Amino acid sequence: PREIITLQLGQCGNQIGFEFWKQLCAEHGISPEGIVEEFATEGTDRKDVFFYQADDEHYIPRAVLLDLEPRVIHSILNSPYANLYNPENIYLSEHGGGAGNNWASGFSQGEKIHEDIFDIIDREADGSDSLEGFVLCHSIAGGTGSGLGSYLLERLNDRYPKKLVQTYSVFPNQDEMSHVVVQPYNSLLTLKRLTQNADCVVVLDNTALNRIATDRLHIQNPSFSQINQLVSTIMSASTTTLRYPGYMNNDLIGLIASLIPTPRLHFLMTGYTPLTTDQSVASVRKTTVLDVMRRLLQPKNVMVSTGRDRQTNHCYIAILNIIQGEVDPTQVHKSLQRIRERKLANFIPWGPASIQVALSRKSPYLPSAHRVSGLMMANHTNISSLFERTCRQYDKLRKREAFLEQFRKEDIFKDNFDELDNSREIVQQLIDEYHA
Template identity: 75%
Template sequence: MPREIITIQVGQCGNQIGMEFWKQLCPEHGIGKDGVLEDFATQGGDRKDVFFYQADDQHYIPRALLMDLEPRGINGIQNSEHRNLYNHENIFVSEHGGGAGNNWANGYHQGEQVVDDIMDMVDREADGSDSLEGFVLCHSIAGGTGSGMGSYLLETLNEQYSKKLVQTYSVFPNQMETSDVVVQPYNSLLTLKRLTLNADCVVVLDNTALNRIAVERLHLTNPTFAQTNSLVSTVMSASTTTLRYPRYMNNDLVGLLASLIPTPRCHFLMTGYTPLMVERQVNMIRKTTVLDVMRRLLQTKNIMVSSYARTKEASQAKYISILNIIQGDVDPTQVHESLQRIRERKLVNFIEWGPASIQVALSRKSPYVQTTHRVRLLFVPTLSFFNMIISCLTLSLSLSLSLSLSLSRAHTCTGKERKRKHRAHHCLS
């Protein structure tokens, strides 16, 4: 029996990456833009019910909730070519329509006011599931709605659905550029506390790294939001492929996370994916092997968290765990030989107190999507954690080397704002 997952998209960023996610999932399951199953999509052996359900007229509807405090992002989805895909009863826009003003406290307070309407939508979707496994939250930690309202929603889900998994795809701000939002560091740190306490798994996606990968690997001069969001949707799709096209192992979300998260608080994960392509590069095909894709993703420049990619501390980082999700027709013997060569060359540095092994999950490819490469791989590591005190949160956080550097930059930005005597009361409710 498939274990259903409900996707919750909060704020402009969350709805944009969520829309790209559904645009990618539909072709992989042979579902058209209006939710109607294509005539050829009958023998795929896939689990559509994990992320979709069928309406009375047999068309497929995503198990998705779309919510925002301003109508702009939602209107873009409702005017797109996928506007008939979603259940319009699962779309929430604040009656005031003024948004959160990029203020965490404002978004949190408005979330508290509308939580009954939102939880009615969540309960309705949960009641329509046969065996609900958990929730996936898509949001940004830098704005007002995704951070503030998303934080309140995390607390509510943790309270009312304490036995269900909550996984987030959290987009971190670009640390290399000065933001127009002066309270962005406060938004990030306040959201981080809720992610630490209320989420079971946080997949960190760094805007800095996404832009760097788009420029250096995809050779895009000025990557658009749609192009960087497509990188996020690729990771989301690949990370759920074993749930949707199951084999004999890792057929549910808890099985995937069990090998990655040794203790409940060590749940901040990074990702890398190869090969990445855009439409105009369809003729630039190279040969892919299991060893090739594994070695590529051990290079820090291919990780979608950029804070330690080019620092001397990168060589000192130790892995707690690694999960490789391999898509394609792969001989298990090739996987074993590739892992053996990686061990012999000592390409991976693991912690001393844990099992020094790379977990591998083999996944089938969608028969409805023609891929140009034989092997594709999603790399999900958990790095060694260093203790770090974030004073303004009054919370001791154990974070990986890469994440601690990313967060220390956010903390530094907060310190700069305080030195400038910025009016912190704008961030307090």
């Protein structure tokens, strides 16, 4: 019916998808090894849209996880949520990889394991006779997720041409350049494949993570154990129309169709306010829907590093405001009434704009059926500031003679560096041209 195959790949893409499947059992009322609660069918009306359909009421995840590093998968099998995963769909015990840290490693390893990489991931494709598409849950940081992920964006474009492609990709961190220095090279090589060899992306910045991780979360030493908490909730938040029973844009080709203006303009800004557990003691007094979307357009919950004074000459075109759970829908048109009076979104002068609001009932659970949740999927034309940030860090590195002799020994014979530079400037010029 609407079966999606997630493509978890890389050192960071496997960990953000590990707790994504772990989030799904707590809201479906199911255990990874059994069914102890009856809340799975009376409370939740649809479960076989991301999981594989049941053979013994065991909803297998439709997931594949490949990585060169064996460290990310050795921290999985000792956890009690790995018995839900199957040891025959992806790998058996003692799976390995390369050495290995290179973008050209996984780019060259795709055609030497070409027979095996297109054998076991295609067995899940013909399980349903109407496949939705493929989401590449991969990474941009490092050479593991960026090297091999650029290969599958090409060969799955023609072997599966009538399928939706759209990824929840995480952006790397640009604070210092000591541990990694190959960061401007492997990022722009995948970013070219994300626009012409891929339809849509969902950007997730790393410098904007610790802006939120010290905002309300109150940590002193930033660890990697907090990167899975902001990411796994908004992943399950994006499929609330798709997993839980909704009516309009209840498919993944429903939501993405109403937000993309044009190809190579698909970078969607994400926002999510409620992350604090001591808000729970004051949501008993009928906290309404009239105050939760006034702060979405206000740049506080954003996960995109952008300029603060560059929003006057930029214009919103498509903005999504997803409320979940208890909505009190007699005032949801009242919340959309107050949008035109502030004009917090700058509107495009050539065409109409749209503020789309939708709702779906959440899990039968006490932290879910009590507190209001707001998921934002914006589309603003100030996203070229990240593309100006990455390009200015790209041409400055090529004048310092950095990784021009250390990178072209394997499988690179011609200069494909300006092939990425002009196509990035094509994106940056067509964005500003789009508001005439």
